[PDB]
Symmetry: D2
Subunit: 438 residues, 4 copies
């Protein structure tokens, strides 16, 4: 099943979450294990070299391992056995030192953490890259006006940059979150059969620290075979990412509507938003995958069956799904086409009624807040009845045209003059984005 | 990613949901389309032959199509284009008739329905097979007694057959559900660009009916590009199946617990080389059933979440279905597979079940005694006298059978032969055998 | 918490799923139990009368029961205890016959089924009512043309009735599904402590059948304390309903868009018209999926009675019923009173200036000239209608080959949406037809 | 519907998430708004006093408001209207200043945030309290041995304290998480009709800052009417808490099994018909919350300046999650501080596999005493026999020439003693408790 894979997953991410990557992660653990126990005096340095030479994914047969797993219950034991048979060919007496003192889940979880680290690194890169380009766009259109849409109904003006800044804001907060969880997530899983590490006796802590250092991972306060919050948390932040990008994709698709035509996805490297589809798809698929991870948390005792198995393919799907949305969001963010003219046109589709408020405040002071209220509802009721722009109806209004010149009315009914804090929001958002950098 | 695929998916099911299977479904649609339109006078019979010759999945390159899809937004257009370029090599003037009057989703949904039918067929087979073997085991152990477990606490007796009968019951109801949705699910998706089928003019219905008949699919009251209840219902029943097998998997894992050791998955004393009994007899099969019952709910909610698809064709929500439905089918196929293995080969330890039964030293049978001593003496007096014997059987900790034998009023009302029977689990099985009877009965009724 | 309850739940449904409704369901079970065991010779007819008199929800204190439940672990034991203390006041020696031979879950599940039966009845009523009005609207607008929208882009013409017929189709299928599960869902839950019903000895089946008949419920092949598929199936179909009405609510909100303004929910103070009704439908379609998966998630219940997973069902199923009842309610309001602007629909139709109708002309000029020549000639006309931006009708009129093959009267028809509605009217017909067939 | 509410929700949490609490949250916003705008010169101080006097939830009719909402589409407009009619009775000319320049969602989101802050405060107190008592229990049983259970199968020894330390570890990580999201979650929602705040002109930022300060909330970089990640994140951590307490609840129920009988829930004020009613709540929450959480994730792609339907879906969902978790924390505390341990039964269960679960501990020692190659064979032989002629491994090894010739009766007694194969058990408890004390500050 790879037909839709190019469209839904980012190639680099798929490489990490492939059989090769999964296998390599565990093998990395095994080699690192031998290395760490050797420096503790548990394994002959001659064996360390033998093991490392066999810890290359390429040397194993996935098809064969797959059938064995179906009988083993996990991936570690069939791999360790296959690793042993490879080390036997060359240094037969080294075979007895592989996977010493460790349990299957140690290899599996640590291997996974290694893959998660490479994954984290990609996601942070793409995020920063996307935030940068989004930052520029926000500034570029910090003041090009478009109508505000509330419950899909026209509302007071807004700016395109204001909208893009909101997405920027969320992305910054996610980079922040990924940064805070990093020291929590990147930990070693080394507990042995029941997490007591008893098999290593007094060389337990020494081997553990050596092992963590070897893999450049932190040593946790204790093993976590059945405490899975670290993994679920990571998945949850990726969930937040899919959701925000989902909002972005929705907004694009609505802006690309025939009856709106204000913003468009870049033209193929009827104009269908094939990129937005990916973003919306991810924001629709991920919640379910995420609840699965939450659902599997109440893992029994020292190792749970079934609940633990449910994590295996779920976490990787989430990472892939999100990698694909980030990739697609980058494409549209750096190349979307804007039609400011059309934005202007759509703005007085309600014929200035959306700007009634801007006029109400001015005539509030020019005359009585009490009198202006009446006089304004009257002009709107008319601009609708005899259907014609509010600018005109107001020009033919004695009290109004007697208090406001033709030049004043032209300004009041100009959306570019009712942008509120639009530019400020973009400023603060872009500001914070640059602050984070450091 | 195929490491865990042999363990989590049934090989036959993966074949259906592979690139080849996906492609073939759509090509089958294309060939059938030409055929149906030819008989309506829209396509020269010479083209029909050209097209069918190119409607073979093997002739296409997945890798290439994959990259094209990333730009197209769907799978139909890149496939149709590739199909056209293949038909051009031989009969160049046949190229203009492929995919005539149809929209991308028509090919995709119909292709899917074809895959779903092959899937439905596997699932029904496996279910029937599993129900059969489960039916025999139920009968075989209709009266082997085991303690009842409530909130994981010991309760009045139950029978192993009774337990297996409940799984049988659920499975029968699912077979029933699968049967009722069949006519609803296996429908054709032919509506064109906006579901009006206007491009075919007055040849619309004729082509439609011909097409349905060609594929052996029913013609729906109308196209359903954005009315997805049919697919969500199918996923939902599969969900129910995952759930039921999940309960079965849980029960096995709990019965295989070291402190229970009453039922075991196949493969020697527990699992594999039963050397050091303590561990190793791991329930690798139950893990699959439990895994599926844990994963499926989320995948199912995704299909529910993607139902409010806008207008004539929705973007994003529709894309979300593509890989989700297949995952559900594969997950369930793997659970059915594993459930079959353990159902037909589980090991029972009736002696250990007996031993576990009086772990509470007959206190779990207090009720069975309470009713008899209710009539022999006063329901009011018996109540007092019984709580007294239990409080003692616990204090001086020793079986209730004993405490009652040393009880004047009790031993004066019930002989030693009577008390032996009252404190025997085998005599307090209630409707255990009846339940197994009714369930198996209904299972045989369904058959027809 | 009742602020949003009037807006999100249908009052009749909330009545069913209230403390009173929950309590009454269990009490109904107890009364029916005594009645059935009496006719088996297990209970004196004098006690049956005493029990029935106490089986009225009104006579109990919810607040008090609630605190007891926090210690009991379920609702049946504190209720049965309170019931016993009420029967004591009058007929003291009747107290020992209440809840005889039954376990807490028997009372709880059966009580629930009773509530689900009332709920099923409301949902079937509302659905049929909604299907009817939707049916008329479908026919009424069977041929008022509106542009087709694909990926939110303009596509070949469609009819408003066509759209509404789709929703009708789905609702018909749900009524059908609700009909098929009815015999499966409305079953009695009577198994006792461990589902063996051993406490009743040989009077087990007799009491069981009498009890099922008393409550007008079917007796299942065996008790189902930990086989929950019946409940999850029902929630699943309600899920299907929320999803369908969700699609409807989405379509309305999109048609109510300022840049569309084609359909509206029933009604300064001008351009301000928010779809408060569609909000409910979309909300339900968004909330229900999660609630449903919870029911699926709770299926692997251990042995004879599961703790935790079973507790998870208690408030979840009722939430689903209430959520859906509110969506049905709101969908009915908008279905029978939505405002249509056929004029605006026409206007929006040539927003692409006839390019959306290029296909309709392509087939005709396919025969008039060469399918090969027509193709070229048509792309040329579209490319121009875009460049010098002006309707395609015009560009085709200034096209020698085209105006030489098609009269001005012929081009006026080809570029008219009303003439490219395909099977629109047929779809509405089949859907409405099937709706009338079901009725019986 | 309050039957199961006492059992599933913590009373204090329900108070926060009640009609009264919801209403008061928005009223607090209204009062604070007037106050902030007055100091910017937009409202007469005499009106500020009139408004504040009307911003008390008690003065309004929920039933009435509920029917109005059914027509309004939200809760803010019917409340603001009702508030206005109350301020009219006394200071009629003050009515025109209420809710000035604000949109419905500003009142609603800010009101909710206020409620979430009170909720956050409860959850942090309970977590700290639960961590403390779990901390003592961990230490108290840091070395009482119980058998390890892998895939529900007996495995090498473990300690009760070790197990409890794992729950402690998770709880500490959650407190840490709650601390990190606090500055992110507690922000003001003030953007007006479309988030431009245009209606206030150049008095926008001044009023905004004054408003934030008034409510003791941070001012975000920009309004967030359709960027909901802050709320979903909070719900997500609460999800993590439900999950962890869910694992704890599961372990208790399994330890309370008749065939185990090692740990029991307090005998809150029959075979030993002791049902784990508390564990039921923890497991239930862990089962219900995932669904509620995905709902909030599902509602994130909210369109433009204000989304209909998806935003409505948040309203009752976030509160349910908070209540559900408050009920699980409550129940977890009860069992944590009062669970009964049967160390003797744990010992008995330990050699249910008759020492085979300790085979590994013997394997390493006999690996050196003799040949790692010879010991291997000799050990599998003793196990295969201890099983066949079914009798303890301690015995089978004592009748083994090579073994009894290499290890004294005193040495074998020790090797087959669980208390001597606890590995890092006590260390894990140490590190976890240590980190718990570290966090404190």
């Amino acid at each position: 099943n790879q037909l839709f894979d190019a469209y839904f997953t980012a190639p680099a991410m798929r490489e990490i979450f492939s059989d090769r990557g999964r296998l390599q992660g565990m093998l990395d653990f095994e080699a690192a294990l031998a290395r760490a126990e050797a420096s503790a005096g548990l394994v002959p340095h001659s064996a360390v070299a033998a093991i490392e030479a066999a810890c290359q994914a390429e040397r194993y047969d996935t098809g064969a391992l797959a059938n064995a797993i179906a009988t083993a219950g996990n991936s570690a034991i069939p791999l360790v056995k296959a690793l042993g048979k490879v080390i036997a060919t060359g240094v037969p007496e080294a075979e007895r030192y592989v996977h010493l003192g460790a349990t299957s889940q140690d290899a599996m979880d640590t291997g996974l953490v290694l893959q998660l680290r490479d994954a984290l690194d990609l996601i942070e890169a793409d995020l920063g890259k996307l935030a940068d380009t989004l930052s520029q766009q926000a500034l570029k259109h910090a003041d090009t006006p478009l109508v505000g849409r509330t419950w899909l109904q026209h509302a007071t003006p807004v700016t395109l940059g204001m909208k893009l800044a909101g997405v920027l804001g969320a992305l910054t907060r996610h980079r922040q979150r990924l940064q805070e969880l990093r020291p929590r997530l990147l930990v070693l899983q080394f507990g042995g059969a029941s997490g007591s590490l008893a098999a290593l006796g007094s060389k337990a802590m020494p081997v553990a620290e050596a092992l963590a250092e070897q893999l450049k991972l932190t040593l946790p306060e204790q093993p976590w075979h059945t405490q899975r919050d670290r993994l679920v948390e990571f998945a949850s932040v990726l969930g937040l990412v899919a959701g925000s990008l989902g909002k972005f994709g929705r907004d694009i698709s609505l802006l690309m509507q025939t009856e709106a035509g204000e913003v468009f996805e870049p033209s193929a490297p009827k104009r269908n938003p094939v990129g937005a589809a990916v973003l919306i798809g991810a924001a629709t698929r991920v919640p379910g995958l995420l609840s699965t991870l939450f659902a599997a948390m109440p893992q029994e005792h020292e190792r749970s069956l079934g609940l633990w198995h449910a994590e295996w393919e779920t976490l990787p799907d989430i990472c892939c799904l999100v990698s694909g949305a980030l990739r697609q969001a980058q494409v549209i963010a750096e190349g979307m086409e804007v039609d400011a003219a059309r934005m202007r046109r759509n703005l007085d589709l309600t014929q200035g009624l959306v700007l009634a408020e801007a006029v109400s405040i001015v005539l509030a002071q020019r005359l009585g807040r009490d009198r202006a209220h009446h006089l304004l509802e009257q002009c709107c009721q008319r601009a609708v009845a005899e259907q014609r722009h509010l600018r005109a109806v107001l020009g033919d209004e004695p009290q109004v045209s007697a208090e406001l010149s033709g030049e004043e009315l032209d300004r009041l009914l100009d959306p570019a003059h009712y942008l509120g804090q639009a530019r400020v929001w973009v400023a603060r958002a872009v500001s914070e984005h640059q602050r984070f950098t450091a």
